[PDB]
Amino acid sequence: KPNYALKFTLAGHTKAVSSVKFSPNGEWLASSSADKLIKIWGAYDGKFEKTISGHKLGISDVAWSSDSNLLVSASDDKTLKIWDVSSGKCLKTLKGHSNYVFCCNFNPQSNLIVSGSFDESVRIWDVKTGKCLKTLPAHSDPVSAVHFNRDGSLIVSSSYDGLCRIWDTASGQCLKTLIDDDNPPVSFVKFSPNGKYILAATLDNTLKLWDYSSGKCLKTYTGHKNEKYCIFANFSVTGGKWIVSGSEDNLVYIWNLQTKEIVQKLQGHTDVVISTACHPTENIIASAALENDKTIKLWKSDC
Ligand SMILES: COc1cc(CNC(=O)c2cc(Cn3ccn(C)c3=N)cc(-c3ccc(F)cc3C)c2)cc(OC)c1
Structure with missing residues (x-):
């Protein structure tokens, strides 16, 4: 079992926080919010660094490039924006979705961006030019998440339509549709x-x-509450091998990855913990909560 303990509480956003992500170099934490702003924080001391402004409506998601130099953000204003973190400059504004953009990620080479939208599509963008390279008619309901695999050859997407799908990055072809017994x-x-x-x-x-190559569900983690919101989940690998997820009972849940037992719950937030992130080298967890709370909390552990 880990021993996560609250170390810092981060206030500054004026509306629901939507996403928190640690930079891959371990130095920074980025946060997005319905207040239309991105904020950068010191990952180890929680000290506020700067605000990144530009979106016209709330920001749903933010994600780092591999070298921690760029961010991409997805917004209700139907754009993504690519930011140079050091200068604060908006480098490109990615226009093409016909509805709110919900989720985004860089590929490992950070030469591409993938996005998912309420327009039920997954789009692939060129980082250098900011132009849309492919539009995938991915789902029949809003796209809840998009993510590249370790070498960037695959994209996985999820949706309210009940499907998880695996896409070939180069061709845009659907390679696999995954779904279990119930269709939640x-x-x-x-x-x-x-x-x-x-x-x-x-x-x-x-x-x-899931073993997606074999199409088999290996393990399930339960005990939390998640019936209404799209909540981030994480692999924690710096100490013990855990699963970390926020919950609609205002707690962060931590499971043992192999045995699936709950090993810790973290108490402190006053609203749904919509987002959590695990530090890439230290046993640090960032958690963020919705409109009744508006804060980010940083937790640290021995293992
Ligand atoms: C059919 O109706 C639906 C209803 C919902 C309900 N929305 C959420 O749960 C939800 C979840 C997150 C967490 N988040 C962000 C990216 N990723 C991958 C996440 N997991 C953020 C926000 C948000 C967005 C904009 C904003 F200004 C402020 C906030 C707090 C809303 C989702 C839906 O599918 C997309 C269809």
Whole structure:
């Protein structure tokens, strides 16, 4: 069992926080918010660094490039924006979605961006020019998450339509559709850090680990509450091998990845913990909550 303890509480956003992500170099934390702003924080001390402004409506998601020099953000204003973190400059504004943009990620080479939208499509963008390269008619309901695998050859997407799908990056072809017995909305998905599995959340209070090549669900993690919101989930690999997820009972849940037992719950937020992130080298967890709370909390552990 880990021993996560609250170290810092981060206030500054004036509306619901939508996403938190640690930079891959471990130095920074980025946060997005319905207040239309991105904020950067020191990852180890929680000290506020700067605000990045530009979107016209709330920001749903933010993600780092591999070298921690760029961010991409997805917004209700139907754009994505690519930011140079050091200068604060908006480098490109990606226009092409016909509805709110919900989720985004760079590929490992950080030469591409993938996005998912309420327009039920997944789009692939060129980082250097900012132009849309492919539009994939991915789903028949809003796209809840998009993520590249370890080498960037695949994209996984999830949707309220109940499907997880695996896409070939180069051709845009659907390679696999995954779904379990019930057809609950799929509210989050991502590849494992070694790229062999996908971790999928469904709006029936369930996280599932899938062998996607074999199309088999290996493990399930339960005990949290998730019936309404698209909540991030994470692999924690710096100490013990855990699963981390926020919850609609205002807690952060931590499971043992292999045995699936709950090993810790983290108490402190006053609203749905919509987003969590795991530091890439230290046993640090960032958690963020919705409109009744508006804060980000940083937790640290021995293992
Ligand atoms: C059919 O109706 C639906 C209803 C919902 C309900 N929305 C959410 O749950 C939700 C979840 C997150 C967390 N987040 C962000 C990216 N990723 C991958 C996440 N997991 C953020 C926000 C948000 C967006 C804009 C904003 F200004 C402020 C906030 C807090 C809303 C989702 C839906 O599918 C897309 C279809």
